[PDB]
Design a protein around this ligand. Structure first.
Ligand SMILES: [Mg+2]
Length: 49
RNA sequence: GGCCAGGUAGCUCAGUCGGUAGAGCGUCCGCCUGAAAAGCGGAAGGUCGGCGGUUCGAUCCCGCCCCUGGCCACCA
């Protein structure tokens, strides 16, 4: 429900994009991908819900 | 070229007919050891063979194609 509002999605997209722009090496980016796009990220749980 | 069964993690396989997909071993970390392994605890890792389509969304539905194993067939 609340996890599916455009406010809570944009909240997750904004946090995802923030970590992505801040990652400055390939190895930090991989951990960013895991946390903001992997099976347990906010955006992944919203597709599971 | 024919028939059957398949292609899912680094290896060996289970599984799923629309929104989470997994095990054994392999990898990494913490405690531990002088350093290890085991044990205990915790992670990473898959374009589910490919390209189109359908769909708000496809490992899963439709189309085309590719490869693997077995049994045939052919032959210097
Ligand atoms: Mg394999």
């Amino acid at each position: 429900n609340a996890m599916l509002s455009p406010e809570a999605l944009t909240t997750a997209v904004d946090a995802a994009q923030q970590a992505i722009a801040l990652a400055d090496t390939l190895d930090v980016l991989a951990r960013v991908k895991t946390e903001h796009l992997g099976d347990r990220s906010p955006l992944a749980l919203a597709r599971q819900a």
